[PDB]
Structures are given as C-alpha cells and as structure tokens.
Amino acid sequence: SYIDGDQAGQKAENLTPDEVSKREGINAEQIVIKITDQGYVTSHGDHYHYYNGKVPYDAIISEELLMKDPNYQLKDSDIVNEIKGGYVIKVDGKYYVYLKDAAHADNIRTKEEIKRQKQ
Ligand SMILES: [Zn+2]
C-alpha cells in the first residue's frame, strides 16, 4: 500500500551513482526512471539500480518523468536539484524533470530508447 515500487524497493546505494556503477562493473548512462524523496531508481546498463541521494548534474532521465506542462514553468519552490538542461523537481507532491530543451533531449531516453540503451 503506497510503498512497493513506490517509496521502497530493493537496492539503495549510499554513495554516488558514479561510485555505484564503476563499483559493480557497468559504466553505462544512469537513466532515472523513478524519483522519490527516499532516492531514485535508474534503468542503467541492463538493469534497474536503486539508491538514495541526489541526481548528479549529468544523469539521464526517463521521458516519462520529464516535465512538459503548458501551464507550468520551473519554480524554485519545487526545485529539489538541478541537472544538465533539466531540473529534477518535486511539484504537486510528485517528481519530474523540467527540461529546458525537450527537443534535442537534455538527458532524456524515451521508454523505447531506454530499452535500447539497456542493450
Ligand atoms: Zn547498476
């Protein structure tokens, strides 16, 4: 009940996503597919990797998480952290990534691409 695949889950690195990857072996792009206050879960390399902390500046986000809203502009009240081109933000009790450039992909893999990036 509002925990499984939400706030909880297996894995939760304490160190940085870079320290995560190079530790285990894969050095692939970390595509954050799920964001929470208790950390995030990335689809990187081949698998899903879960950890707690902040998204690094050059991390990759899932297109499912990015914020394209016709009424919403990036508010510092919702900004939790900033990444390259986008902002990992918590608005309306939910987490998004505000992409300033949704056209050329400012760190965005589509759900389709994510599965290609995991190959
Ligand atoms: Zn991993």
Separation of CA 103 and ligand 1 centre (Å): 28
CA of 2 relative to ligand 1 center, distance in Å: 24
**What is the Å distance from ligand 1's center to 77 Cα?**
31
Ligand 1 centroid distance, CA of 24 (Å)? 7
CA of 52 to the centre of ligand 1 (A): 13
Could you give the angle at the alpha carbon of 26 between the alpha carbons of 58 and 41, nearest 5°? Answer: 60
Nearest of 55, 99, 37 to residue 73 by alpha carbon: 99
For residue 60, the enclosing domain spans 1-119
Is-contact 48 31, C-beta < 8 A?
A: no
Spatial separation of the C-alpha atoms in residues 59 and 3, rounded to whole Å? 25
Collapse the DSSP code of 17 into the 3-class scheme (helix H, G, I; strand E, B; otherwise coil) and give the result.
helix
| Count of domains for the chain | 1
Distance CA 46, CA 35 (A): 19
